[PDB]
Amino acid sequence: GTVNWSVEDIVKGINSNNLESQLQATQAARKLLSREKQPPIDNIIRAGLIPKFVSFLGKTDCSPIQFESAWALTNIASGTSEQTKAVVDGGAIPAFISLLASPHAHISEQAVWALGNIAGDGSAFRDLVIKHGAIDPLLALLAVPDLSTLACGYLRNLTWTLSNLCRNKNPAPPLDAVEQILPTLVRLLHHNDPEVLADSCWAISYLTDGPNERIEMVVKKGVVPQLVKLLGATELPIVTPALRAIGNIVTGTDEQTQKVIDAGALAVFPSLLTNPKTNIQKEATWTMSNITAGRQDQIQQVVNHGLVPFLVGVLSKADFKTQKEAAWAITNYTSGGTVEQIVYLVHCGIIEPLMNLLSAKDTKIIQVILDAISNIFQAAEKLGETEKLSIMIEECGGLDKIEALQRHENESVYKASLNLIEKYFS
């Protein structure tokens, strides 16, 4: 009786002076919008139904129509920016925020979902949602002694919505908004539902993607340990965002980086650096490059965990992108590491795989590598081993590639090449 209705019929009824007729019509709208494929969002919008739906949200006396219209608006906002804008333009935000206090959980759940889709669109709406005061009503929904007493799906919806209020960067969420949210976030990050866990990590990964002051307010809550732990999770949906947070945190101050190391992060990398899911491998190597780009005692930490061998491996065989992250990890290592350390690196077999990479069709990596070689020679120059090093690079045909690059087009390249040639060979 509310299945497959035509847009005009939905209009016909929503316009009647019959509450019940409207309810039936609003529900029919919901079903159209909740259909498997091609929900007639633009058709419903053109019919001018949003204002009507928004107004139904406030019909306290008829919770049923509140729900239906909520669900309907929710799906419209789930669309394009263009469409989401329509919902916002209709006054949906304040109304949805009002529903968070509803006595009907499935209704405030919808409101949660709805606000989730709106802040999702981006910075602008994200901040408008905050300005209408959504954060408190939301957080209030989690003010319970034990998160597990809440309906699983309901808890997931809130988590997801909260994560969206942490998302986007130009600009980043308002500092006080982040400060306000973080506490609940930390608590959610210790829940047993993999879903909640994944989105909790995403939220954190978002907050840690920015300036050091941002990273700090996160690290300041002492969640790094928990992240390192989730970093070891067996579910890829959790591991991915966790590795993102850790990877971001290590782009900050060395003190912040130290935190993840102290947390045991490194012990998981042998696994991560050989992980089957290509992308996890790229993130892992990228993270490693931001660790090798730090304090020597930190580089040493990498060395003690036997991660160099893995870096050699990654450099030797992996997706090119992962190799590019490896190139950096290496170059950064040789850029700030001790002599003894730059030596160990060569002893692990860094030279061959590193040379083979010079054949890569990418001027940028070619620089990072020559750059890296430079650093290595200089360490070998301090041990009068420059010649011996030359042989190696010559043994695996590296020199045969440096003189070729010498005749490369990019300036940075041919120049770096020549220097090496004359200064360390011919």
Partner: peptide, 9 residues
């Protein structure tokens, strides 16, 4: 990354 919006189906 889990994407921006979700449609209740």
């Amino acid at each position: 990354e889990n994407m921006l919006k979700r449609r209740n189906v």
